[PDB]
Symmetry: D2
């Protein structure tokens, strides 16, 4: 089994697995049952920006999603991620649709990890994605579209979202998330994303996740499990 | 009166103003009486590195000081700094000696502030300081030495620390610490510093601080008040 | 007299002072008479992005302006800027209108200077400008508009460009452009800009410039002299 | 055959393959026969810092090596690297010893590539290397030592350099060096390195190189060919 820490922009309330009754930004530590969620007013067809921030000192994982109108949801959770994740991880984004659907279009994604000036660093930014993103590991239905967008989940050539889709994109390089001689490890990610749904109910969301390097889509992870967990423990 | 948030590497226990009975890393919000301290084992004549991290989402200000031997003290405090500081601040380092003394030598200092990709950013790094640091505002006894070091407090040409010294160095540019249309503001600072003392009691420490732009050394701030406060309320 | 190095996005051919017969991107060293220009197809009312790159090793100053349609002009000039500029400079943007006019709207501007890991660094980014940009020194008619844009030159509240306008914006902090113990100094700037003109002839352009710290708008610099020179030597 | 662009810190004059009669910093485009070299005064057992800078606009590849005493060699060569390298490359460091030997110890290495703010970016920094650098692809004799150093070539446990060694370290992620919709691509690398030799003749040097993603050590590349070419055409 994989080790996952994720920030989930969960668009669809699967009450049977813990979701509150609304679209929510969630922090998931090792289970889809978010440790802490916050109500997220999903704005259909509008570009959101998610920032995820953490440092080893503060031991607080935070996520804020905003929409250009200045609306945001935020979630923070105290967690010491060195205690959680292996040292090397890959970082990535996940999406699923299920019975309900949405585009899970990533417009841009940037990530910075620092292991501290005898600091190590990884930083990447995609403001554009290409037909053949060699530094991204595309899993499941993830593809880059004609528009330099990352479609984490299947969209018909007419960009109608498809259901029962799971996709992920991990950065090609493993990331050294916390070393035992490390004083401080911090990371921050940002991606902007377009969730549009013909459905008045979008499903299921997009995560940014940190996983064990080897992580692949868990069979069973479609839909509400956001391509991250093989079940909802 | 100035508005100060500071991370104090306080080398000298002034019990009468709240210090615990030891050298301590402290988070000071608007008073020298640290909101949260942590024991710091002061390693004389050894270079320390302090990192200070904060983001508006997590609302947690963290500081970790380490010495090359892998020894560290850390302090975190939940504070929402937008609630505290004006929007524009200057950032800086402070030191004082008092009756007891130490070199308050800054070897390097880097700082990053981000107001979030429609992000604004300021970043600076001094791994070296020059005779005439035009992007630093030197206050009090702060000078740059023949060694490209920032001596926040007076050192005789033989580098014997002097007592009753206060100095500061603020970066020349004001920093836009939190804007009201801002979704996320984060900053992180790092400086390395050489506290050496002939005295078996060093005094008084070095801070990294965030202040109102106009901040000058408060008369009365020498010694235990680390060039930051005009009294110990 | 000031010392100026500038990359000029010159929209108006003032043949009497050297301009080629077209809108041109120019590299100006110490005179408005560009050392090297390249034809620039000015795209009215379309956002351009200018990048300016230099490092002390290569001793080549390059500028590329592009428009979202993938059209670009580029200009490079071999120059050793340490030989030219003082050590400390301020960096900035300039615009003028003259008899002919245009909006000289800066949407964003980022700048990085490095004096090299015993590297020093300044980096700033404005993706937004505010009513009171405390880290920008606004000169002449430069103001920030209701839209978080930098209007280097006067625009009526209806955003009609005005003529005979000069404005500049320098970053508040001096920049240490080349030190004598320095091995490598590099800088890169990027700004995006909206030149729109009711006129079928826009005038006069926008520069990014490096100047002596103290630089103010030279009396006489309006119009074709882009707020940079007091004459056209 | 691989495609290589390299900056070679060549410590040993192999006159039969073009080297000038001295240790030299060289720019190698697609052959070990440097397009442009500059005399390098090899300082035994002293840490050097190499910076390599390039941008697509200037089309000038520059390298400067310095030693803490302020001594440097520099080499620049006009080359348009998009014309040369595929779009995706891996970046790396190479070293060899041959009959003559040296430690080819990398202390730190940082790299930045930008494909331009709709900029893409990769940045990494190793100020330390670990026993199991998962984001580095170690080839040949490259290992990380007990000291967090990258020993590109074999060193006995007593750190005596061995002869006939070749090693490389490529960053795990492919790098998107130039895209056809790209306006500007720039990269800069920096690494610091300790060449120490018991021999009064060190051999053979260290390169920073850009290669086709798939690049492995070319059989035949030991010694003077710096692990980069299968012959000296
Ligand atoms: O995409 C939204 C949800 O669709 C499915 O769950 C259902 C939501 N409403 C339903 C109604 C009937 C049936 Br059968 C199902 Cl599975 C569902 C499942 O695929 C869930 O994983 C997913 O979260
Ligand atoms: O530098 C250490 C301390 O020196 C002075 O305080 C004293 C510490 N021990 C003392 C003993 C006698 C007297 Br008088 C004084 Cl002020 C002190 C004061 O300057 C304090 O501000 C400072 O923290
Ligand atoms: O803004 C475009 C140009 O306007 C003026 O120059 C003229 C261009 N065409 C003209 C026609 C008549 C007169 Br008078 C003038 Cl000054 C001009 C001057 O203000 C120039 O500085 C400026 O470059
Ligand atoms: O390491 C320095 C050089 O050693 C060898 O070349 C020689 C330099 N001096 C020699 C003397 C005799 C013989 Br045989 C050889 Cl191969 C050499 C070869 O391995 C060269 O590749 C290498 O550059
Ligand atoms: Ca859900
Ligand atoms: Ca004290
Ligand atoms: Ca002109
Ligand atoms: Ca050689
Ligand atoms: Mn959920
Ligand atoms: Mn204290
Ligand atoms: Mn011109
Ligand atoms: Mn050579």
């Amino acid at each position: 089994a994989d080790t996952i820490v994720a920030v989930e922009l969960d668009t669809y309330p699967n009450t049977d697995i813990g979701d509150p009754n609304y679209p929510h930004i969630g922090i998931d530590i090792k289970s889809i049952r978010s440790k802490k969620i916050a109500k997220w007013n999903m704005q259909d067809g509008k570009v959101a920006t998610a920032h995820i921030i953490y440092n080893s000192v503060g031991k607080r994982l935070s996520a804020v999603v905003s929409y250009p109108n200045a609306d945001s949801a935020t979630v923070s959770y105290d967690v010491d991620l060195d205690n959680v994740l292996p040292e090397w991880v890959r970082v990535g984004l996940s999406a699923t649709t299920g019975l309900y659907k949405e585009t899970n279009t990533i417009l841009s994604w940037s990530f910075t990890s620092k292991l501290k000036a005898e600091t190590n660093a990884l930083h990447f930014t995609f403001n554009q994605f290409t037909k053949d993103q060699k530094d991204l590991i595309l899993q499941g239905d993830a593809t880059t579209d004609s528009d330099g967008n990352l479609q984490l989940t299947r969209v018909s050539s007419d960009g109608t979202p498809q259901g029962n889709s799971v996709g992920r994109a991990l950065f090609y390089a493993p990331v050294h998330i916390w070393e035992s001689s490390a004083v401080v490890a911090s990371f921050d990610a940002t991606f902007t994303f377009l969730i549009k749904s013909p459905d008045s109910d979008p499903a299921d969301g997009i995560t940014f996740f940190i996983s064990n390097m080897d992580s692949t889509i868990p069979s069973g992870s479609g839909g509400r499990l956001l391509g991250l967990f093989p079940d909802a423990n």
